[PDB]
Amino acid sequence: GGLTCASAPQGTLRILEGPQQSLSGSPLQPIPASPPPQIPPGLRPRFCAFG
Amino acid sequence: MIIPVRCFTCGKIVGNKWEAYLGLLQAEYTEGDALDALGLKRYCCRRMLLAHVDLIEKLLNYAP
Ligand SMILES: [Zn+2]
């Protein structure tokens, strides 16, 4: 009436919960790159010679 | 701290164009047009007002 060893298991199942990968879009930056410093339009000379 | 009285390189007097400069900037004028309308021709004078930091207004805020 006691507990005895039974037949060895024939296989093992290991369960884990996993989600999946999306598409590669690689959206690097809101406003991207190093935007260049640049000329103010027209500007004009702010200096003249004497005479 | 407070506006220099005379431009350091030339000696031109710029200590009376501080309030006029502030008034022309409140009216919508660029710093270039503003410095022109004040008579600051050579850039040695223009840097004297363009790059002035008025720290007398921040010291004049702690108790007497
Ligand atoms: Zn000067």
Side-chain angles (χ1 to χ4, degrees):
Chain A
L3 300 172
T4 189
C5 276
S7 300
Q10 288 66 0
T12 303
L13 295 176
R14 211 269 243 73
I15 302 170
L16 42 141
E17 177 210 81
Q20 295 177 335
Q21 293 177 335
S22 65
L23 294 174
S24 65
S26 64
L28 352 91
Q29 290 282 294
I31 160 179
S34 315
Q38 55 193 359
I39 319 288
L43 282 184
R44 230 188 75 262
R46 303 242 169 263
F47 172 74
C48 61
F50 51 90
Chain B
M1 210 193 92
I2 187 160
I3 188 68
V5 28
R6 283 204 213 249
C7 165
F8 307 141
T9 12
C10 293
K12 188 202 270 304
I13 284 176
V14 304
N16 50 346
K17 311 171 158 36
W18 185 231
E19 283 88 9
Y21 184 59
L22 293 196
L24 282 165
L25 284 190
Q26 286 145 24
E28 346 107 359
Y29 267 36
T30 55
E31 289 84 2
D33 301 346
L35 290 154
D36 296 349
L38 295 163
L40 304 182
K41 267 84 75 181
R42 63 179 76 89
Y43 63 85
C44 75
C45 313
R46 298 167 69 93
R47 89 173 150 79
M48 204 67 46
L49 284 177
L50 185 74
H52 179 246
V53 59
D54 203 32
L55 305 170
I56 186 69
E57 294 180 354
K58 297 193 166 189
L59 298 146
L60 279 192
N61 285 306
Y62 294 81

